[PDB]
Design a protein that fits this description.
Fumarylacetoacetate hydrolase, domain 2, fumarylacetoacetate hydrolase, globular, binds magnesium ion, five-stranded mixed β-sheet, Exiguobacterium antarctica, hydrolase, dimeric, ten-stranded mixed β-sheet, homodimer, 4 helices
Chain lengths: ~280, ~280
């Protein structure tokens, strides 16, 4: 299970991988500090371990990369109490984006923006990382265009969503797209039945298998790419399970100090704190 | 005053400038093949048109550049009558994006996507080009952040608008963002009252002044950058005057072989033919 990440050394990006529990610095074998560059190139640079470091756990991960275009996001994509027949709520295939300016990496603060929002909310999500440019993907070739998977927190201003009608602005304020901590390779990861959970200050809020997805990974790839080219390094956020602050009775919104922990089994933890400034 | 453009010569991209309707190759004086790199640099490198070879032959214009993130687009932003504007502005500020993969140059065909849309339509628009990274712009610094202005055709599958609810998909099919033909500098262009016109197969379909804009250029800049960072090379499409094919009695939609001409006085013309591909 090769996992890819970027980590910080001397205020400067380096690249690391993870096979069975330890973190080797692979920058030398792969000849770049851009993990986007590693994906776009569309080959793995014949890296062999038992050669390069094994640095400490307090190493500090960065966002995998700055997406070259807006993060593509799916709307309601999760069934609640599994069954629910062949539906959950309407069932339109809803697509919108998040400006790359909104990306932050692991443990980075989420800017609170109290002047702009009093309904700040979380959404824990499985992210598809596109490895090969293509269009009109089929069930047979879809996964061949996937480099791997990561976590997105689709942070959202529920009031800006209605105020600007289209979701773009309320999802795109600086800080609103935690991304990371690592990319697990397509070969090392089956998205059929993985657990997506969110904790806020330690309280379990979201806990849903990818088996509850109304459109699975292959269907998302198939539908998204119809008449629209996907670029190498595209990030597709595949929706969020039940338990969103807005959907709670009564509704609960994120405040200055709140710590959000999104986890996906096989990938890891993306934790960010809401902080004012 | 110098308008900026990009063109193809022996299959390589080149930078040109247009002065008094004459076109010159300035690639050797700005030392790049990318109009985005010129604007991202953040400063005017002095150009002597005396030493610039004039382009006398027909030349292939390209789109000014591939935007480094999605084109930011404003929804309903035009009044119909000059004084149908008494607090009409007080409508919702609707913001959505178009994928850069939808961009095409002036005189590039628009892919028909017959299999996906039966309601292909047009929107002629003034585009703002951002020159300097910025956030929380003010009426008094906003225009300092603006490199220039250009033209966008916000080609729209009205049926995909309704089907996917959020406009992204219906506005982002390959071929749906005609961009160009040139960028006029902020120095040399006042958007307060310039005429926007669209013709389909020669027949006038839109004709409106930027004086009918519900929110003007400076207001758009103030409201879009509120808690969201703008990047140099950001393109903001500022909305479309009355006369779109969806809003006509009876409704009219674009077919194989339709030619659309979009005109903005002081910029030029964007002519694209819809073609089954
Ligand atoms: Mg979401
Ligand atoms: Mg438009």
């Amino acid at each position: 299970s090769m996992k890819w990440f970027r980590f910080e050394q001397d205020g400067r990006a380096r690249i690391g991988v993870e096979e069975a529990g330890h973190r080797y610095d692979v920058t030398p074998q792969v000849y770049t500090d851009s993990l986007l560059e590693v994906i776009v190139r569309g080959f793995e640079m014949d890296v062999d371990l038992d050669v390069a470091p094994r640095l400490t756990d307090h190493v500090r991960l960065l966002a995998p990369y700055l997406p070259p275009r807006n993060v593509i996001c799916v709307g309601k994509n999760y069934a609640d109490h599994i069954k629910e027949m062949d539906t959950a709520g309407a069932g339109k295939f809803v697509l919108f984006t998040k400006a790359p300016s909104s990306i932050v990496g692991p443990f980075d603060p989420i800017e609170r923006h109290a002047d702009l929002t009093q309904q700040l909310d979380y959404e824990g999500e499985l992210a598809i990382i596109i490895g090969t440019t293509g269009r009109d993907l089929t069930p047979e070739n879809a996964l061949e265009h996937v480099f791997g998977y990561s976590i997105i927190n689709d942070v959202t201003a529920r009031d800006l969503q209605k105020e600007h009608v289209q979701f773009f602005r309320g999802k795109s304020l600086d800080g609103f797209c935690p991304f990371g901590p690592v990319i697990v390779t397509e070969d090392a990861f089956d998205p059929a039945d993985v657990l997506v959970e969110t904790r806020v200050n330690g309280e379990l809020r979201q806990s849903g298998s990818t088996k509850l997805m109304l459109r699975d990974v292959v269907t998302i790839l198939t539908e998204v790419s119809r008449g629209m080219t996907l670029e190498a390094g595209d990030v597709i956020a595949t929706g969020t399970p039940a338990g969103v602050g807005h959907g709670m009775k009564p509704p609960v919104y994120l405040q200055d100090g709140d710590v959000i922990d999104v986890s996906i089994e096989g990938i890891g933890h993306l934790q960010n704190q809401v902080k004012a400034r």
